[PDB]
Amino acid sequence: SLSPSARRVQGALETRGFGHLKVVELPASTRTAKEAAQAVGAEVGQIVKSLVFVGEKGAYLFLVSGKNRLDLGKATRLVGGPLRQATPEEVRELTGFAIGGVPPVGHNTPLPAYLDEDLLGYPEVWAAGGTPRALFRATPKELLALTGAQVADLKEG
Ligand SMILES: Nc1ncnc2c1ncn2[C@@H]1O[C@H](COS(=O)(=O)NC(=O)[C@@H](N)CS)[C@@H](O)[C@H]1O
């Protein structure tokens, strides 16, 4: 059913012990946080954007709520060294997925991660499932368990 990249994310959820979480590849786009929320009837804040930044020693994953903008200054202080937004080419090289479908798991390398503390305000959130049509629902606590992320104030607001 699922396209390869979506199947890759579903396989990662299964491998990590969260096989009860299901990737869906929908009849409406989920490319942007706005479209993803409309596709599943969620508030945009419940959508998880998985953003990749490149640092001096490696890359980092920032899981940001769809209602927030990642503050590069805050991210830089958290990592403790310079950071720059990954180009679409670097996103593909690093994660195995392309912009619009970057998931929080299943990458070529598990990236140290940070979770936007506002995601903890929702009982369930939806993260990308590997493609611009794929999402999976999970509780914020399950997302933390899946990524090992550290909770942080990431937003510009
Ligand atoms: N040209 C680009 N170069 C680098 N980053 C980009 C580019 N275009 C978009 N992005 C980044 O990728 C983000 C879009 O991916 S996202 O926020 O994680 N959202 C999604 O993947 C949706 N599927 C909802 S789950 C944009 O908000 C932006 O931070």
> After which residue numbers is the chain interrupted with C–N beyond 2.5 angstroms?
none
**How many whole angstroms separate alpha carbon 27 and alpha carbon 77?**
40
**How many whole angstroms separate alpha carbon 82 and alpha carbon 68?**
21
Can you name the residues that pair with 27 across neighbouring β-strands? none
Cα of 51 vs centre of ligand 1, distance in Å, is: 7
Q: Name residues whose C-beta falls within 8 Å of residue 56's C-beta, 6 or more positions apart in sequence.
A: 81, 82
**How many whole angstroms separate alpha carbon 33 and alpha carbon 45?**
8
Exposure of 92 by Cβ count < 10 A (0-12 exposed, 13-18 middle, 19+ buried)?
middle
Q: What are phi and psi of 89, to 5 degrees?
A: -65, -45
**How many whole angstroms separate alpha carbon 31 and alpha carbon 133?**
6
Q: How many CA atoms lie within 13 A of 105 on its CB side?
A: 29
Superfamily per CATH, domain 1-157: YbaK/aminoacyl-tRNA synthetase-associated domain (3.90.960.10)
**Residue 66 structure tokens:** 């769809």
Cα of 150 vs centre of ligand 1, distance in Å, is: 21
Resolution (A): 1.6
Q: How many CA atoms lie within 13 A of 157 on its CB side?
A: 9
DSSP label of 106 = -
Strand 125-128 versus strand 150-152 pairing type: unpaired
Method: X-ray
**Given the CA of residue 86, which atom of ligand 1 is nearest to it?**
4
Angstrom distances, CA of residue 153 to CA of 34, 63, 64:
22, 11, 10
Secondary structure (3-state) at 125: strand
| 71-89 CB burial, b ≥16 within 10 A, e <16 | bbebbeebbeeebeebeee
Could you tell me how many residues make up the chain?
A: 157
Residue of 99, 105, 114, 133 best suited for mutating to test ligand 1, as the one with most atoms within 8 Å of CB: 99
Q: Are 61 and 50 in contact (CB under 8 A)?
A: yes
Of residues 90, 27, 101, 21, the one with CA closest to residue 59: 90
Cα of 49 vs centre of ligand 1, distance in Å, is: 7
